[PDB]
Subunit: 256 residues, 7 copies
């Protein structure tokens, strides 16, 4: 049984192959990390060399035990293929992960809308991103989904814009409405005066004349400015005699 020496040689090739593979791959993503590339991209590109070299090792090692070479390419091909399917979704998510962290279209702490759902971002991980909805629900979105959909980022821009729509009665003085609104926003310090300050009659409406006011503020103030400017419009408009109308209806009677 002197052809049972090839069994021993097969093992030798595998052990030497596994080590030679382990130390090239380590020694490649040592190189990549020392350039800059990206911790994850390195590990990935590296782990392909690793699994590649032990793929060669398996071919030549089995080959000394008469395993026809072109049957190893085939079996390993299938094996790889079956893994490939089972993972993929992952692979795709893994890649979106990288892109998201290395382009920061949103960063942790920004409030964003990631295709219908919106929340404050907590952390982008391997396959999935975590946000917290204003009210305290946690959402886990797959990195893949995020990257191939629109990313609406409420927070990256430093200055943002409220729009009020105020409806007043048709017999209200157009000039008076504009003046009160203009004098409310003029006096509010949190409204940026060097940017848009639109107060205008915008819509001849169903039962109300509709005025649009649009004014810019720092991103932090936007919420409080809205509320404070509203309370104000309501108070002033009442004290000044301007009526927010209820829904109207001309009814035309008929005794029958």
């Amino acid at each position: 049984l002197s052809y049972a020496v090839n069994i021993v040689a097969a093992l030798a090739i595998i052990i030497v192959g596994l080590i030679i593979a382990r130390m090239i791959s380590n020694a490649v993503n040592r190189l990549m990390i020392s350039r800059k590339i990206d911790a994850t991209v390195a590990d990935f590109l590296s782990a392909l060399v690793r699994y590649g070299i032990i793929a060669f090792t398996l071919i030549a090692a089995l080959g000394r035990v008469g395993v026809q070479t072109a049957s190893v390419i085939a079996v390993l091909g299938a094996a790889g293929l079956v893994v490939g399917l089972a993972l993929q979704g992952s692979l795709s998510n893994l890649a979106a992960g990288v892109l998201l962290v290395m382009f920061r279209p949103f960063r942790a702490g920004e409030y964003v809308d990631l295709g219908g759902v919106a929340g404050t971002v907590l952390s982008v991980q391997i396959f999935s991103t975590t946000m917290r909805t204003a009210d305290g629900k946690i959402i886990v979105i797959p990195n893949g989904k995020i990257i191939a959909g629109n990313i609406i980022n409420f927070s990256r821009e430093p200055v943002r814009r409220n729009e009020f729509i105020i409806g007043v009665a048709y017999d209200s003085d157009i000039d008076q409405v504009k003046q009160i609104l203009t004098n409310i926003i003029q006096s509010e310090d949190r409204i940026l005066k060097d940017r848009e300050m639109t107060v205008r009659l915008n819509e001849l409406g169903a039962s109300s004349i509709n005025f649009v006011v649009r004014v810019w503020s720092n991103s932090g103030d936007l919420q409080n400015v809205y509320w404070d400017v509203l309370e104000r419009i309501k108070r002033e408009f009442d004290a000044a005699g301007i009526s927010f109308p209820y829904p109207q209806m001309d009814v035309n009677f008929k005794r029958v």
Copy 2:
């Protein structure tokens, strides 16, 4: 018929091959489980070696009965392909399974919304997850569908937030409304006082001034806090003389 000895040799190769395959694969996912990896990924990765080794055995075993080698790669290729299709959905679900149990974006017992449907999670199994809708229906969702959709988790966060929207009549005292609401929530112990406590005039409405109140509580209290705070608002507002308005309408008569 001395070339009918290869038939016997073919069998020998298959039996030795089946055993050599069964014992390597067992002896591989002995190794993997002893590291840590994950019971399922072990069994799977293992069962690929297993079916791979008996794939080699079938090639060489049939090969000694003159089955052309490159016809076995082809027939088994097809066979594997036909299986592959029939399973897949399963393979994909099996993989999501792992991911879900080894990332616990939801754990058993959390209430979650898994893409339109929401219920309390019971158990994540091989291909499919089982939840129980608040009212007692059971839903069985495929692991695959779950993992590639958003996961809304109501329960992982320990503190959550009610939002009341209360509408009062236009001639109600703005300051009075804010004070009563503020004094209701101030006194409710279950409302976390070190977090958001927004009481504010939010919308000039159709037939009502709309106030928004937003207050945080432990996740367990959230439901009872809402109900208790509401009963309260209604009682106080009545005793204090504030009117929740019915829908309004100015009608403008015309005899014809």
Copy 3:
């Protein structure tokens, strides 16, 4: 024409091959069925060996009539491919079939919602499942569709939960409403008293105060309990002086 003996040999190989194939395959899913596996997975896995072995037979049999071997892998490849396409939908449905019967996410006789349509399940067959809509329509849903969609099962859980929403007039006594509702459900024996028994003011509404009552019962009782508890609320509420309000409207007259 002594090379017209290969024609005779070609037939010999085919008949021997067809038989040797037919008796291995039978003798394989004899083995599988005796273990446990599953009658269909047996027949399927088996019928692959069968068609595989006669694939080898066709290669070697045609091969002795000078049919180039690597043209048989190709022609049969195409043939298989053309079948493969034509079937598939079936194969996919066949596989869902198995899964459904060997996981019983619903069993025959349970009422279920299989993605928009809901009925009582009758029987899961090879490719398609049959249910009967409460009113007598029959629906036939493809096993494939069912398995990759959510399965809502109304019947597997033994205890379920009604939710009543009752609207009363704003000037109704909050405490009185709660007591009558609570005393209706307290007395109903079919309501499980060791589970949730929520009676609460839930919504300040358009023209009604809305109370929510939620009570659990055995799955069988649920429908009758609802109807009986409702008739009751209506009767008691009337005799007790509580008004279910019609839609309201404050109209504000103007002679013109």
Copy 4:
């Protein structure tokens, strides 16, 4: 030009091949049809042997005129592929055809809903099914679409169920309504008395108390039973003093 004899030999192989192919294939689906299989599956499976055998013939026939063998597998591969694409939709529809005729989830003459459209089935053909809408439009639905969608069959079940929803005024006697409805259905002979006979107060409604009546009848009677039982409810209810209410509205006047 003694190597221009191969041209003559090439033709010989083609003619003999075309005939040898035509007569095996005929002689195969002679065998299939004599078992039982199914006329189309026969013709189809058969026509694959046919086109397969002339595929071999073309390889060996061109091969004697120095056409490299592995170029014929390639060219015919492409040819087949181009056909394959152009047909497919057809192939898929052809297969659905079979399934539909050999499972009769609907048969000719049954009224069915085949994914949004519904009509009386006329005839299932090769690729497409023909139904006639109750009003006389003809619809032609592809067999493929049908088989991968739900099939709702109104007619296969022999007994079906009407549901009336009758709204009466709030001040109507609950017991009186139940009795009149119960006495209408009790006396209608076409209502199957050994099945469900539900008369019950179902919904406290907007401006009406809503009673639900559900009663089963033979499939033929269902339409006429509904109409007749309705005319009846209306007549009896009027003569008995029960009011079907118009939409209600409490209006709360304010001189301004």
Copy 5:
């Protein structure tokens, strides 16, 4: 440079090949057309032989100028593939074309709904079908889209059915309404009397009792019959004292 004679031989093979190809293919779809098959399917199937034979010619012709054979299968494979993609949509549409003309699910001149859009068909061409909307817009629908969607054909059936829904006031005589409607349709000659003639109380409605009338007519008359029968119902009903009600409302006054 006696190995520059192969260049001249290469050309010879191409010219001879192009001609031999052009004359076989012509001489094949001469055969097909003479059987019956279909002018398009002929040209297509033919043009595959054509491009196939010049594919062989290119392999052997380049092959005598040392172009490695298995590089021509590869390059031409790619070329074909790149064409294949660019066309396809076309190929698919071309095939639908055939099917539509050779099954006439609609013919030119029939009014049809081809998935949301509906018009009178003008002409089915290579890739696209042209219809004219009742009002004069032209729509061009791809043959492919048409064939894989439902085909609603208004015109192939010779007799069709109008449905009137007439609403009358609740205090109208049920018997009187039925008689007038029945006597309108009885006298209209264009209504086919040997078919359905349903006049019935169908819906207890919001503010009207709703009668359904359904009557069949020739496809040409259907439009005019509807209009004429309607004018009639309105006239008779008025002269007979039956009221088409305006929307109703019971209002319940409250001085405040």
Copy 6:
């Protein structure tokens, strides 16, 4: 280093190959354009010969520097594949381009609806088509999208059709309405009198009898004819005493 002469020979082959390729391809689409084919299809089909011939050149040229032949088919295969993906969308759009220009389902200047969006076409280019919305927005639609969706063309037909729906009060004379409308359209010269001229009572409506008028005009007149005919109906109807009704309501009073 006399085997470093092959490096020089490799270059020679590439330069001669690049030139021989550049001059055949030029000399092919010289031929195509001189027939008729189509400038783009020529350039495309041509540029495939071009890149094909330099593909052969690269195989044989690298081959004389010991680059294994079946590695060049493989590398270039990958290269081509990577390009293929990156382009495609383009290729598909490029093809739709041709089709659109060589079938003119719309031509520049026609107003068309290309799947939801509609505008006047300006120019169809390589990948994308440009239209101008009636109001001045510019839309750029991908040729690919256009060709696989319906094409609604408002302008190719020379004569089109307005439909007026006029509502008049229930107590209006049916004959009088028809006569005034008929006499309006009779006198309008821009209405084509040899085509449809439908004036008819069409709907017994909520609060109005609804008449439908449908009349055909040249495509240019259609817009002005509508406006002019409408102004007319309104004027005549008023002067003739016919009332366009406001929404109606029978109210049924109840003191409470």
Copy 7:
């Protein structure tokens, strides 16, 4: 160990190969950029030569250490494939990037609607485009999504068109309305008088006669022209006695 000299030769080939590859590729997109092509297309096409040449180097280099050649094509094939998947989305976006910058269907600074979302474009980068919503949100859209959807460009056209719809009471003078509206727009200087100036009675409405006014202006003026022309209509219409009607209703009383 004189066969351990091939290990040294393997390295030599890789270093020489990496350099020879790096200098050809540099020297190719030196050529391309000097023509014109496009910076990105150059780098890409170039980087394919680069990775191609080191693919050849790896084959021959490993090949001198007995790595079977047809196993390197296979392993590298897999490696490339795994990369290919992980990237793709990127590749596709990268290509859209180019197209967008080299066709400028929108340029930085134009306001555009890119499939549901609209904002002012800031910058088109490698994979993703950035726009700023009128109100200050930032949106990041993938280049791929953009290019396969419609591109609506509000700004590339220099002149655009407002459409007012004004509703007046039914008893208003048709001629008077037209004259006032015409005289408002006649006098507005910002309205382009050499283009459309439509003032017309457009819709006989629910409770209002609806006039349509359509007038063209420079793109900059469009917003202010609308607002100014509206304020105007409202003022003039009031001073001239024309009424913008509230919603109407004929009520038909009934004591009960």
